[PDB]
From a paper:
Cobalamin (Cbl)-dependent radical S-adenosylmethionine (SAM) enzymes constitute a large subclass of radical SAM (RS) enzymes that use Cbl to catalyze various types of reactions, the most common of which are methylations. Bioinformatic analysis of Mmp10 identified DUF512 (Domain of Unknown Function 512) as a potential Cbl-binding domain in RS enzymes. We have uncovered the “Unknown Function” of the DUF512 protein domain, which is to bind the biological cofactor Cbl.
pfDUF512 belongs to a subset of DUF512-containing proteins that do not contain PDZ domains. pfDUF512 was crystallized under anoxic conditions in the presence of SAH, and its structure was determined to a resolution of 2.07 Å. The enzyme contains an N-terminal RS domain (residues 1–222) and a C-terminal Cbl-binding domain (residues 223–357) (topology diagram in Figure S5B). Although pfDUF512’s substrate is unknown, in the current structure, L1 seems to close the active site of pfDUF512 by forming stabilizing interactions with the acetamide and DMB tail moieties of Cbl. The RS domain of pfDUF512 has a unique (βα)5 TIM barrel core, with the FeS cluster ligated by Cys39, Cys43, and Cys46. A molecule of 5′-dA is observed above the cobalt ion of cobalamin. The ligand (SAH) in the active site binds in an unusual position, neither ligated to the unique iron of the cluster, as seen in Mmp10, nor close to Cbl, as observed in csDUF512. By contrast, there is significant electron density for the adenine portion of SAH, which binds approximately in the same position, maintaining a similar hydrogen-bonding network, as observed for Mmp10 and csDUF512.
Numbering used by the authors: 0 to 357
């Protein structure tokens, strides 16, 4: 339950599924980059743009919110007309960001900024972001945190910032940064820079360091949903749903959400769809593909009537990431196996979907 500013300066409700998944205050307003925004100026070694399969349809650009000269004007408009809690995110702080910009953003009315920091070691940040000026942002963080509530994002990348994550959190706390969010790196089978996922032992090590720092330091240390999912410890906190369908019913989910979805729907068959299109450690349900779904459909019995539920998050408009149109995927399933396919965004929507088809 949050908002973002549109290109024409209007409000648009959004969900945590369009951000990083963390639960946020309900007066949050995100100021995204406009069309006047340029690129990030980096070449991060883990950059997801650089590890997509070779024949995937290109999606979005390398937008950096700060590379929009109309940002202040959009912040000032939002402050006057909505007076919500204004956050800027999607920035590495390496372009169009200095003391003067911090002042102008503060006077415009910005409340909070969320920066991709990754590490407070300058030489490491230079190599990890392939940007020889990446150390300047680290020097600015104390001044940043004096002006805004500051959230530092860290993409945990083995060989760069995993072993010394405790020192990085201490540095951020001493700079006055208010919050740090820890994201284990996502690696496909097409990564070109010898980036590797955190092992199970590395995930646990970072988790324990983060819990220790969070009970010592004033900085809020956040282990976000993707991290908990990679640890096998993700939960919605919801009571299990006792919906019991009369007809063959399947909930398709990804590898990361499968344990929680299986727990939430004890009388429904939950099907884990492994992501062979992306491979690596990709397992989130918004990255499911038409071909992976069709592989698991192939294993199902034919039915005179049956329901398959898919996560709505895997569709962008009516397209999947691997090039399927929604209606073509659904018609192939109906003709070949007999199932109706429905989609929904959140787990709490599933009982009402099932009830309507029933
Ligand atoms: C972390 C993340 C990544 C990581 C990888 C994570 C991983 N290891 O799998 C990285 C940064 C590598 C990444 C990359 C990409 N990502 Co990404 N990513 C995310 C993000 C921000 C969070 C995922 C998360 O928190 N998962 C935690 C688990 C528990 O969530 P989950 O599996 O989705 O399950 C929940 C819901 O889906 C739902 N649910 C689950 N199963 C089911 C089933 C049913 C039937 C129902 C009703 C509900 C339901 O309930 C669950 C509990 O909340 C999401 C947005 C988001 N907030 O979800 C985008 C998102 C998945 N990514 C997206 C995109 C576009 C990409 C890229 C293609 C970007 C690009 N242009 O290259 C790449 C592809 C891979 C690559 N090249 O690296 C889009 C996908 C949209 C689409 N399908 O067209 C999303 C949805 C962002 C968005 N809002 O647009 N990503
Ligand atoms: N392989 C990967 N694993 C995890 N997070 C990744 C990733 N590749 C990129 N990210 C992070 O996912 C977010 C994409 S949002 C856009 C950020 C913006 N381009 C910027 O200037 O920083 C950023 O925090 C980015 O650092
Ligand atoms: C994978 C997709 O999710 C978006 N996204 C939003 N927040 C994050 C985050 N903290 N880490 C990774 N991707 C994120 C990216 O902008 C990309 O388009
Ligand atoms: S900041 Fe880094 S990860 Fe984000 S788009 Fe630019 S190069 Fe890719
Ligand atoms: K704390």
């Amino acid at each position: 339950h949050m908002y973002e500013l549109t290109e024409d300066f209007k409000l648009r409700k959004i969900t945590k599924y369009e951000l990083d998944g963390v639960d946020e205050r309900e007066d949050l307003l995100v100021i995204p980059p406009s069309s006047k925004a340029g690129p990030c100026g980096n070449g991060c070694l883990f950059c997801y743009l650089l590890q997509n399969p070779p024949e995937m349809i290109y999606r979005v650009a390398r937008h950096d919110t700060l590379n929009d000269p109309t940002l202040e004007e959009r912040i000032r408009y939002a402050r006057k007309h909505y007076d919500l809690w204004i956050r800027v995110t999607d920035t590495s702080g390496n372009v169009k960001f200095d003391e003067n910009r911090i002042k102008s953003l503060y006077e415009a009315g910005l409340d909070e900024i969320q920066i991709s920091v990754h590490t407070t070691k300058k030489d490491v940040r230079i190599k990890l972001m392939r940007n020889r000026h990446a150390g300047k942002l680290i020097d600015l963080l104390p001044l940043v945190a004096k002006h805004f509530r500051t959230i530092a994002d860290i993409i945990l990348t083995p060989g760069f910032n995993v072993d010394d994550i405790g020192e990085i959190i201490e540095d951020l706390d001493s700079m006055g940064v208010h919050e740090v969010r820890l994201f284990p790196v996502g690696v496909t089978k097409y990564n070109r820079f010898e980036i590797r996922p955190l092992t199970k032992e590395e995930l646990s090590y970072v988790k324990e360091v983060a819990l220790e720092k969070d009970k010592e330091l004033g900085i809020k240390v956040v282990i976000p949903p993707i991290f908990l999912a990679l640890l096998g410890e993700f939960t919605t906190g919801l009571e299990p749903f006792n919906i019991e369908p009369e007809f063959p019913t399947y909930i398709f989910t990804g590898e990361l959400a499968y344990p929680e979805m299986k727990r939430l729907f004890p009388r429904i068959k939950v099907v884990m769809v492994k992501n062979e299109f992306f491979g690596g450690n990709i397992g989130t349900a918004g990255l499911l593909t038409g071909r992976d779904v069709l592989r698991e459909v192939e294993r199902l019995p034919e039915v005179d009537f049956g329901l398959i539920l898919l996560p709505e998050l895997m569709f962008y408009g009516d397209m999947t990431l691997d090039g399927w149109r929604r209606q073509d995927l659904f018609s192939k399933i109906l003709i070949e196996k007999g199932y109706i396919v429905e989609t929904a965004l959140e787990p709490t929507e599933i009982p009402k979907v099932i009830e309507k088809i029933s």
